[model samples]
Target: LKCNKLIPIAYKTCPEGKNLCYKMMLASKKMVPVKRGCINVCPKNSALVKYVCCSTDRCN
Candidate 1:
């Protein structure tokens, strides 16, 4: 995703290296929650559900 800042292109980082968007986060950094319909349509146990943020890195 694109943002107005120079966020890290890697996981575990943000457009400004702040919040980590991973599983159960349910919302964007802006605090706008993900649409419920989108989760329902996701495959069971979607990886997105396990991320600490939308980024692929969390433990790093």
Candidate 2:
């Protein structure tokens, strides 16, 4: 993700108290997804982060 001061891509800011984040998920062998965005509260565990933000962008 691009942050402040960027030009062509339109620089923006993260959440009030958060930072840009990227996440990846894999289950068994047939399901896997990857995404990127921003979040306020980072999860202490992998499962929680995956569960919390996997379905939406900037939803953590």
Candidate 3:
């Protein structure tokens, strides 16, 4: 199984180390990615842009 970006167009397959799907989020349009091919880790902020991660296939 593999993950996908906010849109699957030309998306890359995540490396083995980064097997999780991800999307940049906030709270609306701003909450959505502006994207992710995938991720293994996510960054954090205070009410700022966020990298939300998931295990489900193409969860991004």
Candidate 4:
């Protein structure tokens, strides 16, 4: 695998892995399947999401 950024691969095989320089598009907070990377890098054994959080609530 190669990129213009000279980044590392996913997992410990590379430096910090691809997640460090990548962005998560979609995420499911429920049951995840092995066909995808939903519950891949979670320590608690639960579905993990890697998207940026924002204050969507309007406190007006």
Indicate which candidate wins on lDDT: 3
How do these models rank on TM-score, best leading?
Answer: 3, 2, 1, 4
Model 1 agreement with the true structure over 6-45: per-residue lDDT tens digits: 1224332244534333333233343332321111112334
Better of 2 and 3 by TM-score: 3
On a 0 to 1 TM-score scale, where does candidate 1 land against the true structure?
A: 0.16
Sort order, lDDT high to low: 3, 2, 1, 4
User: Where does candidate 1 stray beyond 4 Å?
Assistant: 1-12, 25-57
| lDDT of every model, 2 decimals | 0.29, 0.41, 0.66, 0.26
Local accuracy of candidate 3 as per-residue lDDT tens digits, 7-60: 766455667777677777666554657567666676565466767767776666
Model 2 pairs in collision = none
Candidate that beats the other on TM-score, 1 or 2, i.e. the better one: 2
Q: Write down the lDDT that model 2 would get.
A: 0.41
What TM-score, computed on C-alpha atoms, does each candidate reach? 0.16, 0.33, 0.63, 0.14
lDDT of 2 by residue, 1-60 (tens): 333221223344465655544344455465444433455555544642342332232332
lDDT of 3: 0.66
For model 4, the superposed segments whose C-alpha errors exceed 4 Å read: 1-20, 29-48, 51-60
